[PDB]
């Protein structure tokens, strides 16, 4: 990367906001996944959208790859600079704007996390519900198509992103639904907002997101329920969903994950396949939701509910940190995560089969999951230096993905494709789906410089 080019970057964002130092690049060459660190050639921190546009145009016209970088908490290698180039760290644009509490909407820049937004919204009676366990950039969450424990009731990012501000690869500025617009529904033209949600930085750079806000629940009750078997816990989940109980949260932990979370959070739950549950409503609604849900869990051998503001906070903090709880089982290990999502009636088959397949392997695994969506993660620890173990973990994850595809499901419910699921995506949507996706990629990024090597 030439000295003239570096000086041109500094001319846009300022000398302190460009770095070619090896340590700084290495810190931006990886995410939380096991994918090998591939450092960009430079890291740049634009201070406003005009600077994002000018950095993108400079890179694009010089043939330099662009890698958008939020908080680096992704798990599929999205920020790995597989072809080098310029990593654009977006987090210095950190302003919340256009808060419209009467319309239940707000605009956030990439440096805003969900924690920051919900802190800014306390005493408003509103909150933003989509809750990945990591303190992630909300624009990064839009880019990956994230969900969370609350999505079963309140929707994923796709459900709650109403507009996006996107710097296209050559620097043009697009407001996907129109500048300043926010509304509940539209049939106006083609829906561009949904194309950029889940695009993982391969179609453009999200520089603001317009988010749907939700009313805080009148009353909240959380609980845990221990089961004799994985089958019993997942059967309960399916029956709760088929009974249309509007649960706010329904999260599965297998016994390995329960124990890991116990050790990492000083919860003391019975070591068993467990549901973490949360219910929102009035006192009257909660009582009948609880009655109908305990009746179903009881039918499948569930324990009486162990009830949980501060004890609920500890419960969900433990759940949100499950990834780190699993990593702490074998210190020094990295890990890969699966993320399949299947039609809910097939969820018992594939979860039970996954448990059995983990047991029959010398692989260690923990299972945790947004099972209310038919989604779960298998967390597979890896010795970073054991090449034979990594091959077995990859083979396991690929076979699980293919089993989900055989059941009519998807290889990723929320994490995305990045570097790890590109072959599974080709199987999932077939040749016409792949070509159509690639045609969209090519019209927005003709030179192939917008996060190359990812998704497609
Ligand atoms: C402990 C833990 C728990 C998690 N729980 C969940 C969960 O429940 N659900 C879930 O969905 N994910 C979860 N995640 C994964 C991760 O937090 C999400 O994928 C999150 O959306 C990533 O955001 P980020 O800004 O950190 O992404 P990064 O790693 O910085 O980037 C992810 C991808 O998006 C692109 N990108 C980032 N920002 C932008 C932008 N502004 N414009 C365009 N492209 C961009 C990058 O180029 C990359 O390809 C978890 C991660 C951890 C570590
Ligand atoms: C870190 C990614 C694996 C686990 C995450 O999806 C979660 O549900 O907490």
């Amino acid at each position: 990367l030439s000295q003239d080019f570096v000086e041109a970057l500094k001319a846009v964002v300022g000398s302190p906001h460009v770095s070619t130092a090896s340590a700084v690049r290495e810190q931006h060459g990886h995410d939380e996944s096991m994918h090998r660190c591939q450092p960009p050639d430079a890291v740049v921190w634009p201070q406003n959208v005009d600077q994002v546009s000018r950095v993108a145009s400079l890179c694009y016209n010089q043939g330099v790859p662009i890698i958008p970088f939020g908080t680096g908490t992704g798990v599929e290698g999205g920020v790995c600079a597989v072809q080098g180039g310029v990593c654009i760290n977006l987090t210095h644009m950190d302003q919340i704007t256009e808060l419209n509490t009467e319309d239940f909407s707000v605009v956030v820049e990439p440096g805003v996390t969900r924690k920051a937004l919900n802190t800014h919204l306390r005493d408003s009676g509103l909150w933003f519900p989509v809750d990945p366990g990591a303190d992630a950039s909300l624009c990064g969450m839009a880019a990956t198509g994230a969900s969370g424990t609350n999505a079963v009731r309140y929707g994923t990012m796709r459900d709650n992103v109403i507009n996006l501000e996107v710097v296209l690869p050559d620097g043009r500025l697009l407001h996907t639904a129109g500048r300043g617009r926010h509304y509940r529904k539209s049939a106006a033209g083609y829906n561009l907002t949904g194309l950029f949600v889940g695009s993982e930085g391969t179609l453009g750079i999200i520089t603001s997101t317009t988010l749907r806000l939700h009313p805080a629940p009148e009353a909240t009750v959380a609980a845990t329920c221990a089961f004799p078997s994985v089958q019993a816990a997942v059967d309960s989940t399916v029956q709760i969903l088929q009974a249309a109980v509007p649960v706010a949260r329904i999260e599965f932990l297998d016994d390995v994950m329960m124990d890991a979370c116990n050790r990492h959070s000083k919860l003391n739950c019975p070591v068993a396949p467990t549901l973490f549950l949360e219910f929102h409503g009035s006192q009257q609604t909660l009582a009948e939701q609880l009655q109908r849900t305990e009746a179903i869990t009881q039918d499948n051998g569930g324990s009486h509910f162990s009830w949980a503001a501060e004890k609920r906070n500890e419960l969900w903090a433990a759940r949100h940190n499950a990834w780190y709880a699993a990593l702490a089982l074998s210190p020094g290990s990295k890990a890969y995560s699966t993320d399949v999502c299947v039609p809910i009636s097939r969820l018992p088959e594939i979860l039970v089969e996954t448990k059995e397949e983990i047991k029959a392997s010398k692989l260690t695994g923990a299972i945790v999951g947004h099972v209310g969506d038919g989604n779960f993660a298998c967390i597979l620890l890896v010795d970073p230096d054991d090449a034979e173990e990594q091959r077995r973990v990859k083979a396991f994850a690929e076979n699980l993905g293919r089993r989900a595809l055989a059941l009519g499901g998807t290889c990723t419910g929320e994490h995305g494709i990045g570097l790890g699921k590109r072959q599974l995506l080709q199987e999932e949507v077939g040749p016409v789906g792949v070509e159509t996706m690639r045609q969209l990629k090519n019209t927005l990024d003709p030179r192939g410089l917008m996060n190359p090597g990812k998704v497609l």
Side-chain angles (χ1 to χ4, degrees):
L1 199 165
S2 89
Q3 195 48 57
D4 278 341
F5 186 79
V6 174
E7 293 308 299
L9 290 168
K10 294 184 175 159
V12 176
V13 302
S15 168
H17 301 306
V18 178
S19 190
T20 60
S22 282
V24 178
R25 291 155 50 201
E26 283 184 326
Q27 290 164 37
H28 288 85
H30 67 88
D31 52 17
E32 287 304 311
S33 77
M34 76 179 176
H35 290 288
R36 63 180 292 275
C37 186
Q38 296 194 67
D41 297 307
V43 188
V44 170
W45 287 256
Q47 300 302 297
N48 56 52
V49 181
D50 179 67
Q51 297 185 11
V52 179
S53 171
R54 293 160 58 206
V55 170
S57 174
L58 175 56
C59 293
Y60 189 85
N61 288 310
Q62 296 306 114
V64 175
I66 301 159
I67 308 96
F69 191 107
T71 47
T73 71
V75 297
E76 274 291 10
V79 298
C80 296
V82 298
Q83 292 175 34
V86 169
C87 171
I88 301 187
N89 186 316
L90 298 154
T91 60
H92 291 183
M93 301 157 56
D94 56 6
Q95 285 313 277
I96 299 165
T97 61
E98 316 185 38
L99 174 58
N100 297 299
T101 64
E102 287 173 59
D103 305 317
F104 294 5
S105 65
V106 66
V107 179
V108 297
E109 295 178 344
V112 183
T113 64
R114 170 187 191 257
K115 183 177 185 292
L117 174 59
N118 280 339
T119 296
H120 181 267
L121 289 173
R122 70 188 154 60
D123 311 318
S124 71
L126 298 178
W127 64 304
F128 184 66
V130 188
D131 64 317
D135 190 28
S137 163
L138 289 160
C139 292
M141 285 163 51
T144 61
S147 70
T149 73
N150 289 313
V152 62
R153 176 157 171 158
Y154 295 98
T156 67
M157 293 307 279
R158 177 159 309 267
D159 297 313
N160 288 293
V161 170
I162 301 299
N163 205 337
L164 293 166
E165 182 182 84
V166 183
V167 170
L168 300 179
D170 71 0
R172 286 167 299 144
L173 186 65
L174 168 65
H175 294 98
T176 54
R179 186 193 264 289
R181 301 200 181 285
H182 53 107
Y183 46 68
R184 265 288 164 190
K185 73 181 177 190
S186 176
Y190 313 138
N191 186 298
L192 298 180
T193 301
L195 171 62
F196 287 90
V197 173
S199 58
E200 295 184 45
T202 66
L203 302 178
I205 306 153
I206 296 168
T207 55
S208 76
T209 302
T210 309
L211 293 173
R212 176 66 62 207
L213 299 179
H214 293 254
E218 181 178 352
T220 300
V221 171
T224 70
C225 183
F227 289 90
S229 64
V230 173
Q231 179 84 230
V234 188
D235 275 345
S236 296
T237 300
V238 172
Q239 289 163 16
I240 290 162
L241 299 173
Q242 288 168 342
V245 179
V247 291
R249 277 170 157 166
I250 178 162
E251 290 293 313
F252 173 73
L253 289 71
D254 75 334
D255 70 302
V256 174
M257 182 86 265
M258 197 56 259
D259 172 70
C261 286
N262 277 342
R263 315 191 165 244
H264 188 74
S265 78
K266 299 179 179 69
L267 293 180
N268 281 279
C269 296
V271 174
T274 295
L275 293 178
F276 290 11
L277 300 150
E278 187 167 292
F279 308 82
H280 295 174
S282 69
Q283 286 306 323
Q284 280 292 337
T285 62
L286 289 176
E288 70 184 344
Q289 293 177 19
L290 284 174
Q291 162 162 354
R292 315 185 164 180
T293 305
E294 319 191 67
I296 288 162
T297 55
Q298 285 288 117
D299 290 346
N300 294 287
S303 71
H304 287 135
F305 284 8
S306 183
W307 307 101
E310 176 52 55
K311 295 287 163 203
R312 158 196 176 219
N313 292 343
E314 307 182 344
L315 184 55
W316 297 111
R319 166 61 186 94
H320 283 147
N321 283 290
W323 170 254
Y324 296 116
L327 279 298
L329 293 177
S330 190
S333 297
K334 309 190 163 123
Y336 187 63
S337 182
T338 65
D339 187 32
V340 307
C341 179
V342 295
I344 56 162
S345 72
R346 313 310 294 276
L347 184 65
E349 292 166 66
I350 190 165
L351 263 170
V352 170
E353 178 176 17
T354 301
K355 185 71 194 184
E356 297 172 346
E357 286 278 351
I358 295 170
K359 281 175 55 143
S361 281
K362 300 178 190 203
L363 297 179
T364 288
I367 299 173
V368 68
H370 313 300
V371 287
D373 305 321
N375 171 224
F376 72 97
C378 187
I379 300 164
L380 298 161
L381 276 296
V382 170
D383 187 320
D385 307 309
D386 190 337
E388 186 66 28
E389 178 167 64
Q390 291 183 111
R391 186 258 171 211
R392 277 193 308 261
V393 168
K394 301 286 325 183
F396 186 99
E398 283 167 4
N399 286 322
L400 175 56
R402 291 193 172 100
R403 179 65 179 146
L405 296 185
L407 296 170
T410 177
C411 69
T412 175
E414 58 176 2
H415 293 159
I417 300 294
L419 287 170
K421 305 187 184 83
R422 296 162 74 200
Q423 177 68 25
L424 287 167
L425 176 61
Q426 283 189 1
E427 295 169 42
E428 179 165 338
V429 299
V432 182
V434 172
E435 187 172 39
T436 300
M437 291 187 197
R438 184 56 186 270
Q439 279 177 327
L440 301 187
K441 162 73 168 171
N442 290 340
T443 70
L444 295 173
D445 177 26
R447 287 186 69 168
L449 297 166
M450 181 84 237
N451 206 0
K454 314 300 164 57
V455 186
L456 299 175

